[PDB]
């Protein structure tokens, strides 16, 4: 199910049997929707501060 549309995950996807778990890169936390990743640090990877702060 991770093979199809990233299993609905915003970042990383793990298959578990039949079951799917989304995960995030370090400096991010998974929201209660179980798909979205929110930054936990000031300078998370792959985000452009001058663009984010705009």
């Amino acid at each position: 199910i991770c093979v199809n549309e990233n299993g609905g995950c915003e970042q990383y996807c793990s298959d578990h049997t039949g079951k799917r778990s989304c995960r995030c890169h370090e400096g991010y936390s998974l929201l209660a929707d179980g798909v979205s990743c929110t930054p936990t640090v000031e300078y998370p990877c792959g985000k452009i501060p001058i663009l984010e702060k705009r």
């Binding site: 991770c2 093979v3 990233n6 915003e10 970042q11 990383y12 996807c13 890169h25 990743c37 000031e42 300078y43 998370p44 990877c45 792959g46 985000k47 452009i48 501060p49 001058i50 663009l51 702060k53």
Partner: protein, 250 residues
Amino acid sequence: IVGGKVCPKGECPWQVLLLVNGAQLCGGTLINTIWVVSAAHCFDKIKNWRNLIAVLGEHDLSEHDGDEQSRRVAQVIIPSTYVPGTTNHDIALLRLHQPVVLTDHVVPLCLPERTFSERTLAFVRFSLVSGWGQLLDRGATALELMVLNVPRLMTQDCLQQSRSPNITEYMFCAGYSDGSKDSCKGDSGGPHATHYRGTWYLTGIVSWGQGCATVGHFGVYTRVSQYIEWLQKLMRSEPRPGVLLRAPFP
């Protein structure tokens, strides 16, 4: 970069400038505060390993604005399968002597997980390639960081669309066959960054091609997804004496 535009200052904050005795050597990508991913071929002719500097927060080479951070390169790690003067396995993992300080101008690019990179990122058509390389084939290199959007091709389509080294499973084609847009030799080692759901990831490294923006030819990039586990294991390893390290691949 041929046929691109200036990357507005702070919009390519993971871009690295590699210097050897103050001279422009290659580009690179910052993946965290201590690690830089570049191309193995950038180091084929190094004799003075202590003269190797990485610059973060760089934009304009003519001026110092205070956002630049330079660090000595303490280690250059190359896969055992890379052969100098050849094209395959064109990747290098650089350990900085001291971490860089993350700021609005210095931010790492996400090194994705292999599965996510193969199953999802590999299907995002367009990605950004950047550097201070040649603005034209047989032309001058750029003073300001340039960026270009390039579409990725399937290896079968790249061979069929092209007018030579093989394109291995450790490479991918990206760009245009019309001779208008490409990354160039001075861009070598630089990022091929892919956007997915609001975040940028490292998918390729500027590696090789036949002259810059040559009609009937595409840019060839190291397929980073093949090295995720190799890179991750090395980042968890203790440093070793000596600047150059050849590490087993796989």
